[PDB]
Amino acid sequence: GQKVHPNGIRLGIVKPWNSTWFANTKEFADNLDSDFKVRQYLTKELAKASVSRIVIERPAKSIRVTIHTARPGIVIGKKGEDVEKLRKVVADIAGVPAQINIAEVRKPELDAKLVADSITSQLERRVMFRRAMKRAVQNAMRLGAKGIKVEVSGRLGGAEIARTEWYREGRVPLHTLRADIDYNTSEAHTTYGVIGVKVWIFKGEI
Amino acid sequence: AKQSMKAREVKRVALADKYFAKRAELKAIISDVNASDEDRWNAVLKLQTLPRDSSPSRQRNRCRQTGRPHGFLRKFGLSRIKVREAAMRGEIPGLKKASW
Amino acid sequence: PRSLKKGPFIDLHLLKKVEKAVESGDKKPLRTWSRRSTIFPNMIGLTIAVHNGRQHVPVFVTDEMVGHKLGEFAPTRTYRGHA
Amino acid sequence: NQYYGTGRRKSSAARVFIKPGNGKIVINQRSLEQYFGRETARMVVRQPLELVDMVEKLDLYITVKGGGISGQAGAIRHGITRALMEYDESLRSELRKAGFVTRDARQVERKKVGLRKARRRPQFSKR
Amino acid sequence: RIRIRLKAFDHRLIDQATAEIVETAKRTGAQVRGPIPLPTRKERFTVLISPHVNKDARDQYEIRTHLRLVDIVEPTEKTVDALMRLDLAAGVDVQISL
Amino acid sequence: PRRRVIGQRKILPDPKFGSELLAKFVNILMVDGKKSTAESIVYSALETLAQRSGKSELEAFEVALENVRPTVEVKSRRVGGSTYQVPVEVRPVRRNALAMRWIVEAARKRGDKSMALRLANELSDAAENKGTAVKKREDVHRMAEANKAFAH
RNA sequence: AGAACCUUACCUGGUCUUGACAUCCACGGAAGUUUUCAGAGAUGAGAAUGUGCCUUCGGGAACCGUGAGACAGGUGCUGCAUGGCUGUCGUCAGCUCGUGUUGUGAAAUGUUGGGUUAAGUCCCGCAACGAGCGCAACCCUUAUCCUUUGUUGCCAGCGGUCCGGCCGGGAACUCAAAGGAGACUGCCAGUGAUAAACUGGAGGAAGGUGGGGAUGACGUCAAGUCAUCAUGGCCCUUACGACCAGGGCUACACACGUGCUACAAUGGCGCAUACAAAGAGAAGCGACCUCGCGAGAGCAAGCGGACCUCAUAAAGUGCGUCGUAGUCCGGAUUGGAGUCUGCAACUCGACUCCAUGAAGUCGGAAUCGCUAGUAAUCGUGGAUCAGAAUGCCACGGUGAAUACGU
Ligand SMILES: [Mg+2]
Ligand SMILES: [Mg+2]
Ligand SMILES: [Mg+2]
Ligand SMILES: [Mg+2]
Ligand SMILES: [Mg+2]
Ligand SMILES: [Mg+2]
Ligand SMILES: [Mg+2]
Ligand SMILES: [Mg+2]
Ligand SMILES: [Mg+2]
Ligand SMILES: [Mg+2]
Ligand SMILES: [Mg+2]
Ligand SMILES: [Mg+2]
Ligand SMILES: [Mg+2]
Ligand SMILES: [Mg+2]
Ligand SMILES: [Mg+2]
Ligand SMILES: [Mg+2]
Ligand SMILES: [Mg+2]
Ligand SMILES: [Mg+2]
Ligand SMILES: [Mg+2]
Ligand SMILES: [Mg+2]
Ligand SMILES: [Mg+2]
Ligand SMILES: [Mg+2]
Ligand SMILES: [Mg+2]
Ligand SMILES: [Mg+2]
Ligand SMILES: [Mg+2]
């Protein structure tokens, strides 16, 4: 059968939203449209910066964007010569003045998005999927994670028939609401087609 | 959808908001009860002159991302599929699964 | 249907063509694609070829036809029977 | 002094005041017979005060809101029983044994997606 | 006399905002009435979860809006000036009327 | 059911007679959830019958009730394609239920002008063994009489 | 979750070729505002006008036209090349792993046995010892009480009244929305293997999972979707790409699925009068007053809302009539006269008035849903939406019969 989104079912319990502004009906569609464009752009340039999440907030007639990254030095640039240009382009796109903050991600091997992106890159570079999946599981578990599950599906190895394979260690109780689960996905465009990757990481009870 | 449909929608919006005021004044003239039927006839003949695409009724709601013309929701500006996709990632503020 | 306070409906180009034809004698039949246009008493005695979707059907306006629309005299479906 | 009571039933809420008196019953600034044309509602209202037999020895001032007819009558029962408890405690076991004290928690079930009603299903055919 | 209305999607944030507003207003010297909770608004949506057919499979979502009212009586010229400069947290819609 | 968990539900007495059995009769006669109509109809019919008899509503209803209620019925039991018609007793509550149901169904099929008149005429007839309800009871008794060879 | 034009992907006709939609180079360049002729329109030609804005006066360029190709474009094929998403078995109680042991081996044990539960739920014994995904708990709503605040919500005790909580007033009460208590086989009795548990009783708003929702294990059906989107391979490039008008998707000897309205007296009609819940509102909802029999029209307050509008709830009740008739049941079809939305109601919209008054008297062989505030029946709101619900999604009123048993 099908499973519920691990993020969606815990938004009122343990997980917070990625957008934290208020608006009436007349502003709502425009706000989502601008947020979509901003996130797409920052994803476009900052690909080699290992950015996990982009939080967008709208205090009053302005905007504040906080990006979480594992390589803050390359994002910042030289004494801030890049944050200002990114700020100016975001201000151009959104139509309001902007301010940008950088948050460092300690232990980047415990973030599901980063692991998914790493696995995708390795698959693109022609690496055997079992090798990469086992490395991901070992790296996550050595840093104190309570559990990790990694699933890869698609036309594996260039075969004529697609299939799905997954590995798991620890506890991953998806039916427990209060539990802290980070779940995220990625796609790889190999010479034979697309390969999908999903990662679940279980951290703590409350 | 096709790029042609998106171009057509953009052009229709442009023509509509370009001719809004003139359409308003001619329609106001026609809708009046205290007037001259000759003036009403002239106004009717003039209203047909404008391009058909200037009518607001010629525009179809579509998803801001994909262009799907079915399943629209006015509150968000997206169809059902994209609403669910975005809402499951916490990108729509205050929205969550309901149960009562 | 059409509200009384608004009068009838006619197309400007069709009206122009009709007047130019009437003032200059009974000329050739007039091709037209306008089917939403009502029939005026000035049209009596004329021959108008109305589009039906694929071709132009000739209609000879008489005094009985005043009031309706042109498209009423150009069927758009072809049906002979079943079996 | 007035003895107070509150009753709830279905979607109706009622408030009741009881004092010494000669038997007057007022509901929403109207008499008992004026408010309820149905007889069952009348026996429903009068059951508690008849079980303990202080009909003409008390005066009742009641108001109601929401719901229909039987729901309002049940709310009136609940309120009058609670007020009688607040006026005398030696009667509690007597009214509990008659079921007057339990609050009826039956609500209406919501409509569910895919069904015509709360439980009725659409017509199913094998082929 | 001042009416203040606060709207928010979350109740914890708006409660903290109301607390800081009322404490700031009271430290100036004016008197306060509230906070009064107005009815919460619930907006519901129902959508299909399948790209093609399968009519009976749907999801249902809800948005809640919390709203509260605070009244300021005997305001001082310092009270209002401290009121604008409070810089309430983002995500709370504030309406002030006199 | 397989579980055997149910109990029994409480029934309210009738408005102006203080009887549960009349309330059950009203419920049996009710359609679409319109109880007031059914209770008015039954009250009118009972009043008319009491006037035309003189005893009361209560024991007149009772007397009609002993004349229609059954005492033994049949149940099917498949063996090898055909069925045994085994006779079994009826509990008193089921006796009352069957009596009332037969009475109501017989009264619904008549050609009078009003349902109250229909019910009054039928129940007065049944008070002394002339209606269709007593005929149905006699047929049930006869059918149960024939197949007593399988009554263990 | 709503085909007159548009949507539109299909048909006929008239037109385009670096192009309806992006980037690169060369050249004439404001952006726009009224205009006229020909044409079904696409388009072609023409007439006045602002021709700037930071600017090292070199201009960079929001953005218009021309010339080439590198390219753009495809709702074209393959769901049996794929990602993502969904249906179903099935909310069924199952599905595995590490180490040890047994077997030449596929494999087995654990997961079997006695009780017990809704449950691989729990207790005891056991060549097994432990662990994971499932079950249950954490989440939302309803039923009882407690504390804080009282406006636009409330009116028990007082003063006035135009009888209007209308005013002065009060924070008791309904109610609103934040935070707590509460239900745990907790206590009593009996059985039981002193265990797990089972039958009953007390208190309580609620008793043994109190009611309802969310939550769908490993997998099966080469199940559905290349037309939401994304994507390998194949295919077209003055056309399988692009623009416009008109038509079609609404046909009609027939067959089936899902519905609505009936065939009446537990009813039809007329007059008078009670009692809800939930929800929406700025290119919007629209009162009051006047005109019209009517759909509606004119003028026009209030509202971004516990305040204003939508917006008199219906079945019910009392009185009168009809008295079993294809009817004072039923409302299909058809003729005449209109209203409103919209450039435009012929094909092909909804609604109003007058006239007409079809089949239908409970439905063959067969077949469906439902265990309680349920079935049955009566009204109200919302999304889509210029206009267009008997469908879909929600909300309350009245309120049953039966379950011996497997
Ligand atoms: Mg495209
Ligand atoms: Mg439209
Ligand atoms: Mg509202
Ligand atoms: Mg069309
Ligand atoms: Mg698939
Ligand atoms: Mg061995
Ligand atoms: Mg097993
Ligand atoms: Mg085994
Ligand atoms: Mg064994
Ligand atoms: Mg066992
Ligand atoms: Mg278990
Ligand atoms: Mg569970
Ligand atoms: Mg008890
Ligand atoms: Mg008990
Ligand atoms: Mg297939
Ligand atoms: Mg498939
Ligand atoms: Mg197929
Ligand atoms: Mg296809
Ligand atoms: Mg067309
Ligand atoms: Mg169709
Ligand atoms: Mg009639
Ligand atoms: Mg008849
Ligand atoms: Mg008529
Ligand atoms: Mg059941
Ligand atoms: Mg209902």
Side-chain angles (χ1 to χ4, degrees):
Chain A
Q2 277 84 35
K3 292 138 183 63
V4 66
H5 208 282
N7 185 11
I9 208 62
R10 288 177 185 91
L11 273 171
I13 302 102
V14 176
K15 286 288 185 175
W17 283 255
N18 284 348
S19 292
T20 43
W21 42 259
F22 184 92
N24 294 116
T25 311
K26 181 266 290 181
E27 294 294 328
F28 204 82
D30 282 334
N31 278 347
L32 281 71
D33 200 58
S34 81
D35 288 17
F36 167 77
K37 293 182 183 293
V38 161
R39 280 198 172 104
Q40 165 168 353
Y41 206 56
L42 294 174
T43 301
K44 185 57 173 295
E45 289 107 298
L46 277 296
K48 300 185 323 282
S50 299
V51 289
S52 59
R53 73 202 294 251
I54 323 296
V55 185
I56 293 171
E57 184 178 1
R58 302 180 162 274
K61 212 52 68 184
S62 66
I63 197 176
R64 185 151 49 79
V65 171
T66 298
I67 59 187
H68 297 65
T69 181
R71 307 287 269 122
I74 192 165
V75 164
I76 293 184
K78 302 308 177 280
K79 70 175 75 69
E81 60 86 20
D82 286 327
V83 293
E84 64 93 17
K85 63 185 284 186
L86 270 63
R87 186 274 304 278
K88 195 39 72 170
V89 189
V90 180
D92 185 13
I93 296 291
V96 301
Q99 173 203 355
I100 293 187
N101 297 348
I102 317 296
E104 185 142 12
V105 171
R106 186 182 306 279
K107 293 187 286 185
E109 310 93 334
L110 280 165
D111 196 76
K113 181 69 176 177
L114 277 296
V115 193
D117 301 324
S118 183
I119 295 185
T120 288
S121 174
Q122 286 156 353
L123 279 166
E124 294 294 328
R125 212 168 65 248
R126 283 82 58 85
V127 184
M128 274 60 82
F129 53 90
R130 283 224 178 79
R131 180 66 178 86
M133 276 164 47
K134 293 162 191 179
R135 298 294 296 163
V137 166
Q138 289 155 219
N139 284 178
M141 216 60 174
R142 192 170 39 71
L143 290 150
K146 288 304 178 289
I148 184 175
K149 182 179 159 153
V150 173
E151 158 169 345
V152 174
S153 44
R155 206 171 156 201
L156 301 163
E160 215 65 50
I161 301 159
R163 59 178 184 281
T164 301
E165 305 204 24
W166 50 281
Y167 279 148
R168 182 218 284 158
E169 289 194 341
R171 296 188 37 94
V172 191
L174 297 171
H175 271 64
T176 306
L177 293 168
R178 72 184 161 202
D180 199 348
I181 310 291
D182 194 0
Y183 154 80
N184 207 349
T185 66
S186 175
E187 319 284 316
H189 296 255
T190 73
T191 187
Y192 290 104
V194 185
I195 281 162
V197 178
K198 310 199 174 131
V199 178
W200 296 260
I201 299 189
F202 167 56
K203 292 188 179 184
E205 190 78 39
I206 295 176
Chain B
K2 296 206 255 190
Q3 306 278 318
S4 294
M5 302 309 138
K6 312 176 172 185
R8 290 192 213 165
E9 283 281 324
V10 171
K11 176 180 176 203
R12 272 161 191 151
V13 165
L15 264 172
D17 72 358
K18 172 162 149 52
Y19 282 74
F20 169 53
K22 201 51 67 157
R23 283 192 87 90
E25 71 95 19
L26 271 178
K27 190 170 179 178
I29 284 291
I30 291 175
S31 300
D32 203 338
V33 61
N34 289 178
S36 189
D37 281 341
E38 192 271 333
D39 291 331
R40 300 171 186 180
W41 195 247
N42 288 321
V44 166
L45 275 182
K46 289 285 184 177
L47 200 65
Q48 300 171 35
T49 312
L50 306 183
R52 284 184 183 182
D53 276 336
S54 63
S55 288
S57 306
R58 294 262 295 196
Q59 295 155 190
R60 177 59 177 251
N61 266 323
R62 277 167 153 162
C63 188
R64 305 241 200 170
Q65 286 167 209
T66 61
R68 212 194 172 222
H70 268 290
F72 190 88
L73 289 146
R74 277 171 186 224
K75 176 59 177 269
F76 317 110
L78 310 164
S79 297
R80 34 181 201 87
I81 308 174
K82 285 312 177 189
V83 175
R84 184 165 176 264
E85 290 215 36
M88 281 298 110
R89 294 179 293 173
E91 310 192 337
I92 299 185
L95 189 61
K96 66 189 308 278
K97 292 173 73 74
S99 60
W100 75 91
Chain C
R2 182 67 178 172
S3 295
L4 204 67
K5 63 201 194 185
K6 309 174 91 183
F9 183 78
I10 188 52
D11 268 323
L12 176 72
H13 52 101
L14 188 147
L15 183 63
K16 200 191 319 295
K17 288 212 141 200
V18 160
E19 278 179 325
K20 279 184 182 175
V22 174
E23 87 183 10
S24 309
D26 285 13
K27 298 286 108 175
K28 275 74 54 185
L30 276 70
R31 290 177 65 189
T32 196
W33 286 258
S34 180
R35 294 179 66 188
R36 58 202 191 162
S37 313
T38 194
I39 314 183
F40 288 164
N42 291 318
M43 297 180 175
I44 305 171
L46 286 180
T47 299
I48 300 169
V50 176
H51 195 55
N52 70 349
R54 50 153 164 192
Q55 64 183 357
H56 280 115
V57 166
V59 175
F60 184 63
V61 181
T62 61
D63 201 7
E64 265 285 355
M65 299 180 173
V66 168
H68 313 294
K69 289 185 177 58
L70 282 190
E72 305 214 15
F73 311 101
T76 61
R77 282 144 165 133
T78 287
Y79 171 71
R80 301 299 98 88
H82 276 106
Chain D
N1 197 7
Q2 290 161 308
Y3 298 90
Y4 185 80
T6 287
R8 286 183 198 99
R9 164 91 161 91
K10 274 224 200 174
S11 180
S12 292
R15 29 191 279 175
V16 179
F17 306 76
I18 295 191
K19 77 170 60 184
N22 50 3
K24 185 155 71 72
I25 300 155
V26 166
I27 306 168
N28 259 318
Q29 317 308 93
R30 274 159 63 189
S31 70
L32 172 68
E33 292 82 1
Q34 285 177 358
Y35 203 66
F36 292 126
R38 291 225 47 211
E39 211 55 34
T40 67
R42 296 176 187 182
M43 283 73 74
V44 163
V45 168
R46 292 183 291 113
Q47 263 184 311
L49 211 60
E50 275 190 352
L51 183 58
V52 289
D53 299 308
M54 283 74 74
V55 181
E56 55 91 17
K57 293 161 74 177
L58 290 165
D59 273 352
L60 317 178
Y61 180 80
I62 300 147
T63 73
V64 298
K65 259 207 299 181
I69 295 169
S70 281
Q72 279 174 354
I76 284 161
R77 294 178 66 250
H78 206 48
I80 185 182
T81 61
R82 264 163 147 188
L84 280 154
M85 294 298 102
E86 198 261 325
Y87 160 69
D88 198 333
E89 282 298 326
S90 52
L91 295 172
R92 197 182 176 295
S93 180
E94 181 65 26
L95 294 176
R96 188 157 201 96
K97 193 256 292 182
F100 294 167
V101 65
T102 311
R103 191 253 193 264
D104 194 0
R106 292 187 288 167
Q107 302 298 111
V108 293
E109 294 202 10
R110 53 165 296 195
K111 183 178 184 293
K112 301 167 188 67
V113 61
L115 306 179
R116 293 178 64 88
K117 280 170 74 194
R119 300 216 177 151
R120 167 79 156 97
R121 275 199 200 264
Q123 201 172 68
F124 155 73
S125 67
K126 184 178 282 189
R127 71 189 58 78
Chain E
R1 198 178 64 93
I2 312 163
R3 299 291 180 90
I4 293 176
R5 271 158 65 86
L6 301 198
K7 274 169 162 201
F9 290 139
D10 167 34
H11 56 101
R12 301 285 175 193
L13 205 76
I14 206 175
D15 286 328
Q16 290 182 67
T18 45
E20 57 200 13
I21 285 175
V22 301
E23 288 184 355
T24 312
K26 288 173 75 177
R27 97 185 64 191
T28 47
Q31 50 250 29
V32 299
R33 303 289 274 150
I36 297 144
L38 299 190
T40 307
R41 191 202 156 162
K42 325 211 206 187
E43 197 169 2
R44 282 146 176 193
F45 301 99
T46 300
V47 288
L48 265 55
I49 61 167
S50 197
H52 195 259
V53 299
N54 292 143
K55 179 59 160 264
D56 296 354
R58 303 182 208 230
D59 285 334
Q60 285 175 343
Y61 305 117
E62 178 177 356
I63 283 186
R64 287 198 194 177
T65 304
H66 315 253
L67 170 56
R68 292 180 179 90
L69 180 65
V70 175
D71 279 340
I72 312 304
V73 167
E74 286 283 337
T76 304
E77 74 158 354
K78 308 300 295 297
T79 301
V80 177
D81 292 329
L83 278 164
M84 283 74 74
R85 73 175 178 87
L86 198 50
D87 203 318
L88 276 298
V92 194
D93 199 53
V94 182
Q95 172 180 290
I96 292 167
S97 195
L98 281 74
Chain F
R2 299 185 184 285
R3 297 298 307 163
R4 183 71 179 171
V5 178
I6 65 168
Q8 194 269 329
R9 212 195 278 100
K10 297 296 289 183
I11 181 67
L12 281 77
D14 47 12
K16 64 91 175 179
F17 274 116
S19 164
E20 295 294 328
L21 188 153
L22 279 295
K24 179 70 84 173
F25 192 78
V26 172
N27 276 343
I28 286 190
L29 183 62
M30 171 180 48
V31 298
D32 290 320
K34 288 166 118 163
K35 199 187 280 304
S36 183
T37 302
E39 71 176 8
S40 66
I41 281 173
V42 69
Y43 278 159
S44 179
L46 271 173
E47 182 65 26
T48 300
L49 188 153
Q51 283 301 320
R52 217 163 69 192
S53 68
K55 277 74 69 177
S56 78
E57 295 90 331
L58 278 291
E59 69 275 16
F61 198 65
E62 192 64 58
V63 161
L65 279 179
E66 292 89 6
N67 278 103
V68 189
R69 82 166 74 194
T71 175
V72 56
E73 64 193 335
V74 308
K75 301 286 173 142
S76 283
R77 191 245 184 277
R78 207 200 59 77
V79 168
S82 285
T83 47
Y84 283 165
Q85 297 300 300
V86 182
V88 287
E89 292 266 17
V90 285
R91 312 173 259 104
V93 298
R94 192 156 161 74
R95 299 182 183 193
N96 274 315
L98 291 160
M100 290 188 209
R101 182 184 311 156
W102 295 345
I103 284 284
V104 170
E105 190 74 344
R108 284 229 190 103
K109 64 179 73 174
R110 257 178 181 275
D112 297 348
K113 298 291 180 68
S114 158
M115 176 75 210
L117 183 62
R118 280 183 172 75
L119 165 71
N121 273 326
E122 187 69 61
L123 188 153
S124 62
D125 294 337
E128 58 89 21
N129 310 114
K130 298 298 293 295
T132 47
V134 74
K135 177 79 203 94
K136 161 174 269 300
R137 204 261 315 163
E138 268 150 15
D139 289 340
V140 167
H141 186 283
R142 170 172 166 257
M143 169 172 209
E145 175 83 5
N147 310 321
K148 65 179 73 174
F150 314 117
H152 296 133

